[PDB]
């Protein structure tokens, strides 16, 4: 891959029923809690966490890379405070794909002062195909997807050096 066009598929503002403005101190930008610029971390709004739904038909004109996370809380407490109801799940599907993942919970060593974890997955969404998310919690959503613009023999070079 030689180029990407970054498309806004599922805009932050389109979830009126959940809290999209949450962040963490592990992503902190100059002391202030932040999060992945390309992701939305959904939490309860008004003590409720209604089913979250989103879909994208691909009008981009080319294939699109899409990524989503699922949050794995440190304890049942965290699960409740964040997503309210337990026994949650995250569902993604397309012409070819199926996943319903459940939030594995384990007490883990603090990493970045964080016992929770986020498991991300990706897929290639074909032209004219459609992606479906629905979840009752622990869903880290894409606000974006990457359309493949230019294609070609290329590579990833591992070096400590700089561009002259």
């Amino acid at each position: 891959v030689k180029h990407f066009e970054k498309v806004k598929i599922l805009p932050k503002d389109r979830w009126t029923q959940h809290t999209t403005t949450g962040g963490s101190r592990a992503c902190a930008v100059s002391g202030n809690p932040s999060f992945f610029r390309n992701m939305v971390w959904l939490t309860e709004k008004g003590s409720n966490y209604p089913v979250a739904k989103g879909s994208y038909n691909n009008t981009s004109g080319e294939q699109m890379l899409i990524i989503w996370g699922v949050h794995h809380p440190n304890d049942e407490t965290e699960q409740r405070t964040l997503y309210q109801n337990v026994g949650t799940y995250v569902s993604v599907g397309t012409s070819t794909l199926n996943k319903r993942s459940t939030p594995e919970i384990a007490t883990r060593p603090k990493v970045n002062g964080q016992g929770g974890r986020m498991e991300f997955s990706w897929t290639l969404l074909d032209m004219w195909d459609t992606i479906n998310f629905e979840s009752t919690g622990n869903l880290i959503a894409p606000e974006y997807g990457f359309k493949i613009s230019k294609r070609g023999s290329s590579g990833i070079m591992k070096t400590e050096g700089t561009l002259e």
Partner: antibody
Framework: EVQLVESGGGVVQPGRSLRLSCAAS????????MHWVRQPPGKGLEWVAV????????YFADSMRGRLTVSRDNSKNALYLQMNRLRAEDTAVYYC???????????????????????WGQGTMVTVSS | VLTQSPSASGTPGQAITISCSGS????????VNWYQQLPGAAPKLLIY???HRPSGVPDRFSGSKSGTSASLAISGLQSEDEADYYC?????????????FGGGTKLTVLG
């Protein structure tokens, strides 16, 4: 070496006003919603106020209506309390405490409500007399 | 305001239990934390969100809540355990949201 140190305490005359600070160290201040709570001298504890990590929202005790300004300077690791029209009741030790969260920071109280106050200062004593 | 037993006492090796009670507003809705203040000094959090203890806290201590009441327990007793004990819970009252503290409890190890 995570700690908070309260200063500004002393004697204040009733009808006048009091100004107090708290110095945070050994941790990231701006990610933590912070607390003011006082213990009258030999009696129990009284919640005073709370200020959000980003300073976006404040909540005051019903006791504190109209007398209270609470502010914070994140870059200075500073907590600021200013209280007007004092009295004998307001005489007490004053405490700056840190509200604990999961990893997570957000606008709703629903998050923090499950937790609370994992670190305190040694306080600063206030006595009200003319 | 919340409410607790006036005072308590027990023996080394003994297990003792202190209670906290309050409105549907606070405890009924929001959960409870427990703080411990040793004499001449400042508070330190004993328990958070009902059952859960923080790090650095011995196992003998542990607690719970049901309905609008909550409870705290020490399974075995050392001289170090002599202090004042406070239940605390968020309210979500009107006027506005607010933290609320129990009056207090003092216990004695009887040394």
């Amino acid at each position: 070496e995570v700690q908070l140190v309260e200063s500004g305490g002393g004697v204040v005359q009733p009808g006048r006003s009091l100004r107090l600070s708290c110095a945070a160290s050994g941790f990231m201040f701006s990610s933590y919603v912070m607390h003011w709570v006082r213990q009258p001298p030999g009696k129990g504890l009284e919640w005073v106020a709370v200020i959000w990590y980003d300073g976006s929202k404040t909540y005051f005790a019903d006791s504190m209506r109209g007398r209270l300004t609470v502010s914070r300077d994140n870059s200075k690791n500073a907590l600021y309390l200013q209280m007007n029209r004092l009295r004998a009741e307001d005489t007490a030790v004053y405490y700056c405490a840190r509200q604990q969260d999961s990893g997570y920071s957000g606008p709703e109280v629903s998050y923090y409500s499950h937790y609370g106050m994992d670190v305190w200062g040694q306080g600063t004593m206030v006595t009200v007399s003319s | 305001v919340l409410t607790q037993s006036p005072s308590a006492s027990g023996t080394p090796g003994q297990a003792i239990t202190i209670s906290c009670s309050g409105s549907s507003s606070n405890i009924g809705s929001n959960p409870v934390n427990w703080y411990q203040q040793l004499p001449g000094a400042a508070p330190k959090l004993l328990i958070y969100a009902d059952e859960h203890r923080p790090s650095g806290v011995p196992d003998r201590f542990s607690g719970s809540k049901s309905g609008t009441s909550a409870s705290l327990a020490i399974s075995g007793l050392q001289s170090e355990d002599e202090a004042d004990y406070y239940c605390a819970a968020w309210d979500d009252s009107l006027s506005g949201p607010a933290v609320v503290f129990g009056g207090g409890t003092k216990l004695t190890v009887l040394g």
